[PDB]
């Protein structure tokens, strides 16, 4: 029914109201960083290895103590009921059935306790709130509901200027709510409060500067996500993929280094791991599957990605994800 | 009404006679430098910083002793009554209300004494005239009218070959005059005469060679504008943005280093300051706002740019323009 | 009738059912490596030499002890009866008449004994089978039939995901069979078994990593083909042409270094030899000639390539292929 | 009537039979080098100098002892009566009136004695003939007719494959003859014979390798033309402009270094001299002027180029062509 992610997006374009598709597809400003995320992955070529034993090819990884089926998690994407009536529950169920971590947003259209109840060891994405006490109660909620990691999003002191939204007069419909509720910019002091408040690993999403990666490790982060936020925050922010190699070297095994932005295939996952990522986050494509076919859509996308990943690892001579990290790359043209 | 500068230009294209739009939009020769000004800014990506205190984000700067609201001034653009009946007065009033310096041209279609009377601490742009005595009387006029800086334009021994103008038979209409009047190429001797004749800071516009920047500082310039003149002078002249980093390093704090050409957004201002500029000049977009909506148009453009700038600084972790200058960049592709 | 290879392909597009043309033309995944093979050859420019003695310009080479008319062989392409009723026999006859080695596939639609009987010293391309004993009997067959080299294809643990085929529901027609029959991934242990089983030179096709080239030489390979398999295996695998220079230097005369992917002209052959290749393989264009005009088509293509090669060598000042290898190159843009 | 060279070519496209325009416009093979000649000049940007004394801006040069009005000569272009009934005489007259050297071809459609009689100190371009004695008699003819330099073309052991000509069945019409007559590849021995046979400076056209430039100087060449022959010889040969800087450094003042290919404006002339050329050759654009308007056309083109050159030198701060050679450049993108 679907052979690549490309045909998914077309499906979602038909199903969704254009102002919802635009909300999902769009970037900030002139969408330079949105485009650059794809340019970066397309410039990377792999140097595959030949003739290696591929008896037990496995795409599994251990991350934050738990096994995952792929080196991938579902990116935090707010208001998932915009794309399908079951919203976050459809996606979280498909993620659990696929063995892939799911990231519950601070701004989910279903409450985090409900999404966590689905099972499948989920993660919680935090946005720093007005006062510290509410922020730490959010952490506590997610911790009590059984979430396994606090994904502290650090690149949104405020939202980027999403011009597609401005020229649509797009507003949150009234059947979509911030189910976790009945906002202020974070600092390294905020990170310290969260780290002190939880035993869960704390993961900072939106690190792009080598020195912010070093400071994340010193701050006790269990990991970072190297990310320009899908090109929706600072327009002109460097793509995560372009900083990944440097950051991995500076961090020097001190924490997990994830990357997101533009992952559209198993080959892209391979590239990311060959540049040194522990895992990737996938955002928009998961929402395309959700809008096209609900939970079964996302399941199919996750299975198609699982096959593409295992395909690419074997054709490159990698029996484990660790070996994929030891691949070399070469930059190409366009 | 307007979300980016892009939609402004479209507005001005409708309102203006095509031969006036062409006069404003065009470059010299094959317009290679015109295009290259945009290519240069689009190749630059910022490495934003995270989690920094943004309590008092301020886009203000001190330049030539005075406070400015943004790190930006209105570029000198001759014959502004081509674009609107109020011409330079509409733009200067909007500049003053926005806290942004305005550059009165030697070739303004309203006299400099009138434009300065608007208030708002303006600057005077000088073209070297036939004989030294008239040139220095121009300086004296501008100094007496209360102008705060002499912007000595040094890259026009004569005008570039504007081919759009040749193929339109465009000529100055008879309702547009050089209101300052009832021309010869400048040299370093001319700069010295002007410097001796005024206590105002002297700023050389059109410096592109690292060694001309060094000599500007030795000559006593209070600053330079690194500029290929909007691609209207030497076609094939390197973009200012591409020389900015080198020049800033060679000048080593010896004078203010401004840049112009292609600034089209708050992100572009951020890029320029991350490459080391003290401030930028904006030319064509201001004229688009003037032609579309007179003084209120320019006010809106200046406010939209002010928001975009403050947006971009905060998303990049910069509480001051000084911090924006300490950002790193990375060159991308196309 | 035909002046370049370009007009051949058009001819084949008309003659062939679209799902057969797609099977021939297509790559894996998003076809990034397919495209990159052409991008790589188009970025390379030659620095020709002038005024050298061109009395006896000869395109001949000695490879694996035998003389060849051109520094080129026909790439292994399975199921050649898809393109013409005479299939591999038409191509092998044209190859023999042109003095160019022909590579019999494991998956040929005519048996290898028949294709070898055509004459013209052919080569045998091996895919590792289910059990070692069948694999080595294949080698033995080809050796007994008089094949001169075992081209061990090492980059297909399994096939790449050919999306053009998936979206056509393309399947092998019933008049096309694997005539050699009435599959498992290879390892360096497999290479060693083959080397021990034959006195023929063993050539590993699909080497892209410098260290796999070094290991090939240590393994006793008489040569390698530096190849990403025409962009049909790992999508995103670096083009052979981009690794050729490095590999040639690492191998340091230890074995023949061939390259394939994207060769479309005599100039391309020249580029490959200037980067250090001993010879190239040509795949798709030969099938275009086969589909357009059977054996006479391939003969014409081989003659047109022979002239283009000799043309390019002489205009570059090369009397022998050895001299072409001593040419320098320069990388260009797009 | 004409503002740039662009509008000339359009004029010639209308006037000329398409198979004649194609003969003039076309390159060899896939026309990669034809295109690359323009790409190379468009990637080069100048770093202009400011505020320099421009009292006596002069575009004149001394080359081979004689004064020329511009740093430019008309490239050798065979069979000029294809483009206009007056052929080489129209062009040579316009060249003389403009103070620009003219290169008489071995294959001119008017005899060299006639073209030289026009005046204006012309040059003779030599192709090595069947036997040495005829070749040296050609040199002697040109020397006796008063030619001032032997432009020995060294990059045509035979002609490139001009595919536009093959697909037009283009043949020399019967009103166009090789007026110098009633061919064999050259070697360094041929150069030595010519040098011994004439006191005229010998200039080798088609040098692209740094070491061929060194050997040209050792051979006693009074100069070289760094040229890939307008992309009509080896398709894929590096553009002259891309080798010019290296060659100028290796030659180290030992001979004049000219360049051709793609010169289309005064800016292009400036770029070439900033990379170190003594002068350029211009080919196709001169034929466009000849076909559009005969002798007056070429005169207009030469005057338009003279103005563009003087324009560009002054805007870059160069009072002499020597100063233009001391400009720096910067490579850009596309
Ligand atoms: C597409 C998309 C991405 C969003 C997202 C909403 C959408 C519709 N949201 C929003 O914050 C946002 N600013 O848009 C949000 C939207 C509306 C209101 C408030 C917030 C969140 C979020 O909550 N908390 C986060 O940590 N990241 C977010 N991302 C980025 C995502 O997680 C990956 O970084 C990136 O999508 C990888 O790229 P790719 O899609 O190419 O795989
Ligand atoms: C668009 C434009 C730019 C002009 C301008 C006129 C126009 C219509 N004029 C003219 O000299 C000129 N040569 O066109 C002029 C026009 C007509 C007659 C005589 C003179 C002046 C000028 O007086 N004195 C100067 O110092 N600079 C000038 N600029 C360049 C501007 O100040 C910025 O350097 C650049 O515009 C930044 O680029 P961007 O627009 O992308 O922000
Ligand atoms: C176009 C094409 C290339 C094939 C080919 C089939 C086709 C239709 N086959 C296939 O394996 C394949 N995977 O498609 C095969 C097809 C279908 C079923 C099973 C196998 C073989 C093969 O048997 N054994 C090999 O060693 N290489 C193969 N190549 C790659 C070729 O030899 C050159 O490497 C490359 O074509 C140079 O590039 P270019 O064409 O630009 O000159
Ligand atoms: C366009 C053109 C260029 C020719 C030319 C003929 C044409 C129609 N001819 C031909 O040899 C040729 N091979 O085409 C020729 C044609 C037909 C029969 C036999 C010979 C000669 C030639 O006699 N002796 C030479 O030394 N160079 C030649 N060029 C190259 C020229 O002098 C500059 O190198 C280049 O044109 C600079 O580039 P640009 O045009 O961009 O300024």
Numbering used by the authors:
A (entry chain A), B (entry chain A), C (entry chain A), D (entry chain A): 2 to 183, 206 to 357
Text lifted from the article:
p-Hydroxymandelate oxidase (Hmo) is a flavin mononucleotide (FMN)-dependent enzyme that oxidizes mandelate to benzoylformate. Its Y128F single mutant unexpectedly shows a new reactivity and is able to oxidize mandelate to benzoate via benzoylformate, a four-electron oxidation reaction that is typically catalysed by a monooxygenase. In this report, both biochemical and structural measures were exploited in an attempt to address how a single O atom dictates the oxidation level in the reactions catalyzed by wild-type Hmo and its Y128F mutant. The present structural and biochemical elucidation nonetheless strengthens the idea that the FMN cofactor is versatile and cooperates with the active-site residues and substrates in dictating the oxidation cascade.
